[PDB]
Structures are given as C-alpha cells and as structure tokens.
Design a protein around this ligand. Structure first.
Ligand SMILES: NC[C@H]1O[C@H](O[C@H]2[C@H](O)[C@@H](O[C@H]3O[C@H](CO)[C@@H](O)[C@H](N)[C@H]3O)[C@H](N)C[C@@H]2N)[C@H](O)[C@H](O)[C@@H]1O
Ligand SMILES: *[C@@H]1O[C@H](CO)[C@@H](O)[C@H](O)[C@H]1NC(C)=O
Length: 246
C-alpha cells in the first residue's frame, strides 16, 4: 500500500507520495530506461491500495489497477464505490470485500464520461493539493455529480502525476493554490497510451516513432514528437502502458 496525508503536505511530501506510487507498480523491463507496466497480473495482486487522508484526517482507500494506473473504485468508511465498467466490476471481486454495501457509480472512469457527469471539461476544473483535499472530502459522502468532479481531480493528482514528471511538478506548484491544468497537462494525459505505444514501437525502429505524437508544450505551442530523444521521452514520462493493453 501507498499513503498520502494532506495535513502538513508540501511539495516534498507530495513528491514522496508520487515516488511511492510509481515504485509500487511492478515491472520486469525498462524500455528506453522507462519502466514498462506488465501485460497482466492475476488475482488481488493486480490492485494497489492508496490510502489518502484529507486535512482533517478522514480517509479513503483507492484501488488502482497496477497494469495501467487505472483507478477502479474506492472505499469510504464502510461503503465501496466502483465505476460502471467491466474492469471495475472485476476489481470489486478482489478489493473492499468487507464493505457493508457496494455502490456502482452511474458512469465509467473515462473522461469522455466523467466530464459529462461533472457538467464540465477538466480544462475548467482547478487542480492542486487543496483540490485533492476537497476531492477526498467529497468522496466520503455519496453524491454522484460531485463525485465525478472529485474523481477528475483525484485521477489527475495521483495517476497522471505518477505517469508524467511534468504533471507531478504542476501539482507541486499548486501545493497551496489550485489552478486549472495547463494545456500541456491535458495534452499529456490524452497522449499517454499513444506515447507508450510509440516508445515501444521505437525499440525495433532505431528509436523512431512509427507514428508521431502531437502534444501541446509549456509555452502553449503544438509540437510533434517523432523519436525517443524528445524531452517527453528522456525526462517526462515515467511509466509505459504495455502495448498488449493498447
Ligand atoms: N488515465 C489514467 C487514470 O484515469 C483513468 O481514466 C481515464 C481512462 O484512463 C481512459 O481509459 C479507460 O478509461 C476507463 C477505464 O477503462 C474506461 O471507461 C474507458 N473506456 C477506457 O478508455 C479513458 N479513455 C478516459 C478516462 N479519463 C482511469 O480509470 C484511472 O482511474 C487512471 O488512474
Ligand atoms: C528527433 O527529434 C528531434 C526533436 O526532439 C528532432 O530535432 C529530430 O529532427 C528528430 N530526429 C528524427 C530522426 O526524427
């Protein structure tokens, strides 16, 4: 298990948590020095439990599929909540089994679904450590509309930060003040599977992408990533979705 406490949190302790999160994900290879997530894990070992504590010390446990980072559901007091999707129902067979009741959320875990439920795109949802504190609090008491927005915050401040060093730094900058994610942040989130695939296709292609990945940069400019010498590959991305799962 990995843990993060919002009480007394700072860029350092958050950095420690994201490091722990990455280190809890199993790999047997690195591709271009980046850990390659496993094709599959069987049984309960497939799911990492993240223990998150809001400022007041209240807690949720979040279940994360270790092969893809995907958060399937969470436990709040004695109630479990899972996304409305086959992978999450499968997760419900292994985690939070001692919960008194199980609620299936009325949406899948997809942005194309969470943004609809929340009533807003995540370009307009501020993220940061204060937002994460809020998200935890929201998820403690069931409210499906509010939970959608909370989950958008949760996903980006945990999973997306684990995958991209840039996103981790974005959140560290938002330690004490929330701000909507940069265009670059959104771009990276949307491109993770694409980038993972192309970095893997590059291993037999002299480090060259079979298909270029288009990203927005930090200055707000749109750029083509064509090979492994790009800063996104050498410095930014921290985890690769296995092509078996793409
Ligand atoms: N991004 C990683 C983090 O956020 C995901 O959310 C995103 C899923 O990445 C994407 O992929 C799958 O999402 C759902 C899970 O299968 C499915 O509904 C969907 N059909 C799939 O495409 C989807 N496209 C958008 C959604 N924004 C997670 O579940 C998660 O908790 C994880 O830590
Ligand atoms: C690789 O990417 C860099 C940009 O990061 C670019 O300057 C260069 O032209 C690319 N090389 C190839 C072979 O595509």
């Amino acid at each position: 298990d990995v843990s993060f406490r919002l009480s007394g949190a700072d860029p350092s302790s958050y950095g420690m948590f994201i490091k722990d999160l990455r280190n809890a994900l199993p790999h047997t290879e690195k591709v271009y020095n980046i850990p390659l997530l496993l094709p599959s894990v069987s049984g309960a070992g497939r799911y990492l439990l993240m223990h998150l504590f809001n400022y007041d010390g209240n807690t949720i446990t979040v279940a994360v599929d270790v092969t893809n980072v995907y958060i399937m559901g969470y436990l709040a007091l004695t109630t479990s909540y899972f996304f409305n999707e086959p992978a999450a129902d499968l997760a419900s067979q292994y985690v939070f089994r001692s919960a008194r009741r199980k609620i299936t959320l009325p949406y899948s875990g997809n942005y194309e679904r969470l943004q609809i439920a929340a009533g807003k795109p995540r370009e307009k949802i501020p993220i940061g450590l204060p937002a994460l504190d809020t998200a935890i609090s929201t998820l403690l008491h069931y409210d499906s509309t509010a939970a959608a927005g909370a989950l958008l915050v949760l996903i980006q401040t945990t999973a997306e930060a684990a995958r991209f060093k840039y996103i981790e730094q974005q959140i560290q900058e938002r330690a004490y003040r929330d701000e909507v994610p940069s265009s670059a942040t959104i771009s990276l989130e949307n491109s993770w599977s694409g980038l993972s695939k192309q970095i893997q296709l590059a291993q037999g292609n002299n480090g060259v992408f079979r298909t270029p990945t288009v990203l927005v940069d930090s200055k707000g400019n749109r750029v083509q990533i064509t090979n492994v010498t790009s800063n996104v590959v050498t410095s930014n991305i921290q985890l690769l979705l296995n092509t078996k799962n793409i």
